[PDB]
Design a protein around this ligand. Structure first.
Ligand code: ANP
Ligand code: MG
Lengths: 139, 204, 72, 144
């Protein structure tokens, strides 16, 4: 990353700073990485964060300089398509089924996140074009 | 191997013959298992046995115990315990055998509408019930003149007489009628008087 | 069609001639069961055209010959 | 002689508790009676052999997720014969019947395990992608 990227990232970082001390929480580090185009797992985020404890995750604040090595480390379609075809073979996916699997398996997300990403993507049958949804969420 | 972290195993327990435990650290060949209980335990792996692995939950509760992938005492006892306590089903196939658990309670399942529902249906079609054995015997007798038997085994008080009673009630209903079933049930008091005894474990 | 009500296998802290006869009757019934189930499995393996050799019989005949043979 | 003349059907009755409480169950009573009724030895004798049996139709319906789209034929039976030999190493561990697949005891739970672990990995990867998009949208808001 060059100076310009670091400056834009620091500015965004400060925009996510809700206390004015130039810092974010550990729990925001992943959010910033994802906000910058990365798609790390929560496990990967905790690993680059150093597997923080609950207390520091909820109250310890870190500035851009400590976040930066983690962003660097994280930085350093057909598989995604087959992954979606797991839940298919008419090129569709049930909205109920995608909602169920995203809210009930793996590292379960909230219903509101799933509603937000799925809003406008299911048709009248309750089918999602997964190639279009995948391209959209990867753009 | 099959014994990974977040596997589940049955471990022996004094007060219920087996209890569930989750394998809290994956096993490698040797003497240790870190186990977690619904708390925290370590269990000696000793001559040798691995603890009996646990079936995936899609299999648990199915109508036929041989549908289970791991077949062993605690998985069988668990499937019967869940079907009986949670479902309040009292009948379960094991292979050819029908297992029947005494509820000590009356149940609606012996109604003549259900008698009709079972008639003409093969064992695959419907959830197990004593009528599903009676109907099989009846149609085996129809196919081929060979006589058919029904054999009922268990410690006294397990309900063998009531099972026979509903078995012949099935025949009386499906054939129609000649007041056999009344006479047969009226004979039971004398055969129980001349033929039954108190025993150390069990009366009648 | 015939219905047989019979006692099952029996074990107490003390076991005696009654329990010995009951357990021998139950060994006989369990043999006839195992051999019927084995017959039905050989039929189902014919139905699916699978070689018979894969299924082995489990035979309690040595305990019956222990109880009822001459010099039993 | 009376029974061997005849074709039997078996019922086993078990008595879940001594005190006749309605719909209560006692594991230490029942293990005794399942032992005395020979249910447990019947099950032990079935655990050797091929206790678990699957129709090719229902097997394929259940485990399409394991199959790569390269190797899904429109003939299910040959697809299954191709796939199971990849998924399970030992041909001894299963037999291809005419209409049904026969498994030894372990194998169906192993297939359920590998299915669940694959589906977990796919779920996690997709949901991290979704979370990443939603944080990128929230970053666009944070600039705006
Ligand atoms: N399927 C069933 N539905 C309802 N009650 C049942 C059932 N099976 C058994 N019972 C009850 O179990 C108790 C004893 O059953 P029963 O068939 O009379 O056994 P029994 O008289 O002790 N014959 P035995 O077991 O040889 O001593 C009674 O309270 C029955 O109501
Ligand atoms: Mg009674």
């Amino acid at each position: 990353f060059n100076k310009d990227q670091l400056e834009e990232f620091k500015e965004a970082f400060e925009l996510f700073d809700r206390v004015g001390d130039g810092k974010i929480l550990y729990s925001q580090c992943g959010d910033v990485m994802r906000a910058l185009g990365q798609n790390p797992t929560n496990a990967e985020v905790l690993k680059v964060l150093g597997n923080p404890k609950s207390d520091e995750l909820k109250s310890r604040r870190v500035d851009f300089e400590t976040f930066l090595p983690m962003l660097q480390a994280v930085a350093k379609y057909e598989d995604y398509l087959e992954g979606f075809r797991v839940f298919d073979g008419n090129g569709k996916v049930m909205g109920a089924e995608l909602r169920h699997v995203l809210t009930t398996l793996g590292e379960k997300m909230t219903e509101e996140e799933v509603e937000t990403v799925l809003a406008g993507h299911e048709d009248s049958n309750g089918c999602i074009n997964y190639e279009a949804f995948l391209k959209h969420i990867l753009s | 191997e099959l014994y990974t972290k977040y596997a589940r195993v049955w471990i022996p327990d004094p007060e219920e013959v087996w209890k569930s435990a989750e394998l809290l650290k994956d096993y490698k060949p040797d003497k240790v298992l870190q186990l977690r209980l619904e708390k925290d335990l370590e269990y000696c792996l000793d001559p040798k046995e691995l603890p009996p692995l646990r079936n995936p939950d899609i299999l648990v509760g199915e109508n036929d115990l041989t549908a289970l992938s791991y077949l062993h005492e605690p998985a069988v006892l668990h499937n019967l315990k869940v079907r009986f306590i949670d479902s309040k089903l009292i009948y379960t196939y094991c292979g050819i055998v029908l297992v029947a658990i005494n509820p000590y309670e009356q149940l609606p399942i012996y109604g003549e509408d259900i008698i009709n529902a079972y008639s003409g249906q093969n064992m695959g079609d419907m959830d197990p019930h004593i009528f599903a054995v009676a109907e099989e015997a009846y149609k085996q007798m129809a196919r081929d003149e060979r006589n058919q038997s029904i054999i009922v085994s268990g410690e006294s008080g397990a309900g063998k007489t009531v099972s026979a009673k509903y078995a012949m009630r099935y025949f009386a209903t499906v054939s129609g009628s000649a007041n056999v079933e009344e006479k047969v049930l009226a004979s039971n008091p004398i055969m129980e008087s001349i033929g039954n005894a108190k025993t150390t474990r069990n009366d009648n | 069609i015939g219905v047989l009500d019979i006692y099952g296998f029996e074990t107490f802290e003390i076991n005696s001639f009654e329990q010995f006869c009951i357990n021998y009757a139950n060994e006989k019934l369990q043999q006839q069961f195992n051999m019927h189930v084995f017959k039905l499995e050989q039929e189902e393996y014919m139905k699916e055209q699978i070689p018979w050799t894969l299924i082995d019989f489990y035979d309690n005949q040595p305990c019956i010959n222990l109880i009822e043979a001459k010099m039993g | 002689e009376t029974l061997n003349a005849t074709t039997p059907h078996y019922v086993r009755c078990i008595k879940p508790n001594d005190f006749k409480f309605p719909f209560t169950f006692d594991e230490k009573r029942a293990v005794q009676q399942l032992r005395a009724c020979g249910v447990l030895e019947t099950i032990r004798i079935s655990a050797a052999g091929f206790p678990s049996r699957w129709t090719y139709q229902e097997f394929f319906s259940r485990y399409r997720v394991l199959m790569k789209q390269k190797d899904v034929l429109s003939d299910r039976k040959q697809t299954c014969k191709n796939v199971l030999e990849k998924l399970i190493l030992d041909k001894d561990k299963y037999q291809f019947g005419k209409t049904k697949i026969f498994f030894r005891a372990g194998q169906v739970a192993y297939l359920e395990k590998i299915r669940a672990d694959k589906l977990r990995a796919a779920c996690i990867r997709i949901q991290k992608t979704i979370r990443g998009w939603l944080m990128r949208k929230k970053y666009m808001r944070m600039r705006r």
